[PDB]
Design a protein around this ligand. Sequence first.
Ligand SMILES: Nc1ncnc2c1ncn2[C@@H]1O[C@H](COP(=O)(O)OP(=O)(O)O)[C@@H](O)[C@H]1O
Ligand SMILES: Nc1ncnc2c1ncn2[C@@H]1O[C@H](COP(=O)(O)OP(=O)(O)O)[C@@H](O)[C@H]1O
Ligand SMILES: Nc1ncnc2c1ncn2[C@@H]1O[C@H](COP(=O)(O)OP(=O)(O)O)[C@@H](O)[C@H]1O
Ligand SMILES: OC[C@H]1O[C@H](O)[C@H](O)[C@@H]1O
Ligand code: NA
Ligand code: NA
Lengths: 306, 306
Amino acid sequence: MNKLVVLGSVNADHVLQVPSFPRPGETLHGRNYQVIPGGKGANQAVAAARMQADVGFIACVGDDSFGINIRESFKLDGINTAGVKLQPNCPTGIAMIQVSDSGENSICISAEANAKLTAAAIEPDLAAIRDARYLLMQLETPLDGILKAAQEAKTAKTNVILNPAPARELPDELLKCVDLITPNETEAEVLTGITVYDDSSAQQAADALHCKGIEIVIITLGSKGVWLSQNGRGQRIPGFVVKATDTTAAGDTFNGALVTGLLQEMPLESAIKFAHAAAAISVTRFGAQTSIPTRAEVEAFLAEHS
Amino acid sequence: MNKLVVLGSVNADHVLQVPSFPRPGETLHGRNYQVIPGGKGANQAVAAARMQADVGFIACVGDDSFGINIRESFKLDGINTAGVKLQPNCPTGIAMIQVSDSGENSICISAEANAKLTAAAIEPDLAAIRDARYLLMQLETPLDGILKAAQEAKTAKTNVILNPAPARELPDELLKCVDLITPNETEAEVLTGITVYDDSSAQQAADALHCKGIEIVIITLGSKGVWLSQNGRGQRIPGFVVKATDTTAAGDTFNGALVTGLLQEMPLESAIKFAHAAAAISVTRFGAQTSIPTRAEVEAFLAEHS
Ligand SMILES: Nc1ncnc2c1ncn2[C@@H]1O[C@H](COP(=O)(O)OP(=O)(O)O)[C@@H](O)[C@H]1O
Ligand SMILES: Nc1ncnc2c1ncn2[C@@H]1O[C@H](COP(=O)(O)OP(=O)(O)O)[C@@H](O)[C@H]1O
Ligand SMILES: Nc1ncnc2c1ncn2[C@@H]1O[C@H](COP(=O)(O)OP(=O)(O)O)[C@@H](O)[C@H]1O
Ligand SMILES: OC[C@H]1O[C@H](O)[C@H](O)[C@@H]1O
Ligand code: NA
Ligand code: NA
C-alpha cells in the first residue's frame, strides 16, 4: 500500500514556442514543436515520485502508442501504475500549449481518455485510497470520480489534498471533504468570488474556503510565493526568484513536492519552502514532466539558497 | 512524367474546439480534438488527385509517424510521391487551430519540415517540373524553392499557377514567372497595395498583376465568386449558394479543381465554374483534406444544381 495516491489526468502536451500570444485575427508563427508528457495528474505524480514519495497513480490513458508508452515510463520514475487504466478505442488526453520567451504559457486541453475516470472506474482503487496517508487530486478528470475518492479517503484517515486546477466551481459536498486546498490566484476567485490581490483579499478568499470546511488553504501567487492560511491565520511564504523559461507544471511540481514534504514529516512551512525550491527549478526548464527536478537537485538548490 | 506537379507545404492540422479565445494563464477546457491532414500544398495535391489529375507532389514532411504515414496515404490518393522528402530528426509542419465558440479562431503554425524545401532541396525534382504541363504552388514553403521552381518551369514552357497564400509580398522576379495567379481579396491587396472594394478596384488590382507579367488573374471573392481578368479583360463569375460552415480548404479545393479542369481541356471560364462547385462542396464540410470532394461528388452536385 502506497503512502501517497495521486488521482488525476495524463496528457500528451503538444507544445510550440511562440514569440507572442495570438490575437483573434492574425496567424502566429511558432517553432520547435515537441510532444511532451504532461497532464496535471501525471505531472504531480512524477514530481512526488522524483521527490522520493511512495506513490501510486490512479488515472486513464489511451490505447494509442503514447498512452501505452507513458504508462510504462511512469514505472521508470518508480510510480506504482496498478491503477493506471488503458482505455480501448480512446486517445490519451491532450493539451495544446504555446510558451513565449517570457516563460508565460497558454494551455487548452481535450479530455479524451481522462473522461473515463469515473466513480465506477475507481472502484478497484478504493482500497489504495483507504490505505494511503495522503490523496492528491486535481480537476482534469470527471468530478464524480474526484468526489467518490475524497469521500472514501475520509472514512480511512487519508489526508485529502485538492489542487483545484484548472479553474471551475465546486460543490460543497466536495470542499467539506478536502483537508488542504492549493488554488492559484485565478482559481481562488472562481471558487470564492473573491479576487486575490493583496494580504486582506487573500485572507478573505481563504476564510471563504475555511467556511467551506477546508482546514488549510494555500493560495499560490506565482513568483510572489504563496499565501498560507491555517483557520483564520494567514501569512505570505515567499518563493525563490529565478528567470522563467516555462511555467508549465510549476504548480504541479509545487503540489507533488509539498505533499511529499508533508508525507515525510516536514512541518508545513518547511514543506512549502521545499516545494518552492522544486517549483523554482522547474520554472527554469522547458516542458511539463521534462522540467521536474530530482530530489538531489532540490537538495542542492536548498543547500545553495538556504 | 506527371502532367501536373504541385509544390508546397504539408501540415498536420491539430484542431480543438474551445469556449473562448485562448489566453495565457489558466488552462482552458476544449473538446472534439482531431488531427486532420492539411497544409496548402497537400490540400491542393489531394484536391487534384481526388479530381483525378495526373499529379506529382514535391514537398518536405517529417520523419514523425505523421510524415511517414501521410506519404503512404498520398500514394493511395493517386499522387506520385517521388518528390516527397522525409526530413530526418524533424517533425512534419503543424497548424494548431483552436476554434472558439465565441466566433474568432486562434491559429499558430510552425514550419518544421516545410522549411527544408529550399532551392537546393528540389534539384532532383527539376526534371519533373520541366516535364509537367502545369506547376501549381502556394507560399507556405520557403521563397527560394518557390522561385527556383518557377524559373525552371518558365524555361521549360511549363505553365505556372501560383496561389499566393498565405499572403506575403513577392518579388518581381517571381511574379514575372507566373502565368496564372489566384489571390483572395486580402492577398490581392498585399501583392498590389490595391484594396478590393468592388469591380473597378478588382480590375485595378488585376491590372497591377498584369503589369508584373501575369497573363491571367483570378481574384477569389469569398461568397461573391471570382474576378477573372484575362490580359486586361475582367468579369465576375459567381459561385454557388450553399450553407458555408468551414472555409478552411475552400481556396485549396478551388485551385486543385481549377488546374485539373484546365488539364482536361475545359475552357477557362468553365474550369472556374467547375472549381466553384468543388470549393462549394468543401465549404459545407469541416477541416482541411476531410472537406475535399471527389470528382464523383462534384459531378453529383453539378447534376443536382443543373
Ligand atoms: N517566476 C517564478 N520564479 C520562481 N518560482 C515560481 C515562479 N513562478 C511560479 N513559481 C513557483 O510555482 C508555484 C506555482 O506558481 P504559479 O505560477 O502561480 O502557478 P499557477 O500558474 O497555477 O498559478 C509557486 O508557488 C512558486 O513556488
Ligand atoms: N489562418 C489559417 N487557418 C486555417 N488554416 C491555415 C491558416 N494558415 C495556414 N493554414 C494551413 O492552411 C490550410 C488551410 O487551408 P488553406 O490553405 O487556408 O485553404 P484555402 O485554400 O481555403 O485558403 C490548413 O490545412 C492549415 O494547415
Ligand atoms: N460562402 C461560400 N459559398 C460558396 N462557395 C464559396 C464560399 N466561400 C468560398 N467559396 C469558394 O471557394 C473559393 C475560394 O475563394 P475564397 O473563398 O476567396 O478563398 P479563401 O476562402 O481560401 O480565402 C471561391 O472562389 C469559391 O469557389
Ligand atoms: O499544469 C500543467 C499541465 O496542465 C495541462 O493539463 C497540461 O497537460 C500541462 O502539463
Ligand atoms: Na518549466
Ligand atoms: Na470546409
